[PDB]
A paper describes a structure:
Macrodomains are ubiquitous and evolutionarily conserved modules (approx. 130–190 residues) that recognize ADPr derivatives in their free form or linked to proteins, including ADPr, PAR, ADP-ribose-1″phosphate and O-acetyl-ADPr (OAADPr). A yield of 40 mg of pure protein per litre of culture after a simple two-step purification process was obtained.
Surprisingly, these mutants were active towards OAADPr. Interestingly, in [name] mutant, the absence of the H-bond between D40 and G36 structure caused a major displacement of the β3–α1 loop of about 4 Å towards the distal ribose, occluding the distal ribose binding site. Soaking or co-crystallization of this mutant in the presence of ADPr yielded no complex. Hence, this study suggests a novel role for residue D40 in the stabilization and organization of the β3–α1 loop, maintaining the proper conformation of the distal ribose site for OAADPr binding. A rigid body outward movement of 5.5 Å (hinge in residues T131 and G135) takes place when the active site is empty, yielding a fully open conformation, as observed in the [name] mutant (salmon). In addition, [name] mutant revealed an additional structural role for this residue, apart from the catalytic one: maintaining the proper architecture of the OAADPr site through the organization of the β3–α1 loop.
Residue numbers in the entry: -3 to 185
The structure:
């Protein structure tokens, strides 16, 4: 059952939608990766499959050249082409491992969103879709992650002109959680 909602934040639009992020026609989609940039869970696989094999090659080059063979640190971002995807670019990020660094993980998760949005702003890209970063069966609790995600996006869109930001959720359950949290956040502006 397809569902979405939109709320304007100054001249920006924030949308939450049930959907397959690989099919988004926003200029940018976000891949929540492992630090190698070669894998990751859930959407990562689907993104690599849908983008084609040139993506993995572009990730390997980023790893070799810009990252000097190192993992992308948690909360940072890099950008590649989208290759076969209907989106033009992929911003790749690494979300924190839930309870690895309890006192830093809220900021680190926030960083994924804020660094992605800054890049979009600097590069004058006008639309971006995020997946649910770091969530999953062995991961960050959806209720707290959703709150950090929306809070961070709302605060950024209050202070910056960006355009359209989507949160694309494959799970109806997750969408409903984002919907409640968003209502709660918009009334208490």
């Amino acid at each position: 059952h397809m569902a979405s909602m939109k709320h304007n934040i100054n001249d920006n639009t924030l949308e939450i939608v049930v959907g397959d992020i690989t099919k988004e026609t926003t200029n940018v989609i976000v891949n929540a990766a492992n630090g190698s940039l070669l894998g990751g869970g859930g959407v990562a696989g689907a993104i690599h499959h849908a983008a084609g094999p040139e993506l993995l090659k572009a990730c390997q080059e980023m790893r070799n050249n810009e990252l000097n063979g190192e993992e992308l640190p948690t909360g940072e971002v890099i950008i590649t082409s989208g290759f076969q995807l209907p989106s033009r670019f992929i911003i790749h990020t690494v979300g924190p491992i839930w309870n690895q660094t309890p006192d830093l993980q809220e900021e680190l998760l926030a960083n994924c969103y804020r660094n992605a949005l800054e890049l979009v702003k600097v590069k004058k890209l006008s639309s971006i879709s995020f997946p649910s970063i770091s969530t999953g069966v062995y991961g960050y609790p959806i209720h707290e992650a959703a709150a950090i995600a929306l809070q961070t996006i709302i605060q950024f869109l209050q202070e910056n002109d960006v355009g359209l930001v989507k949160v694309v959720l494959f799970s109806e359950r997750d969408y409903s959680i984002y919907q409640e949290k968003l209502k709660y956040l918009i009334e208490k502006i």
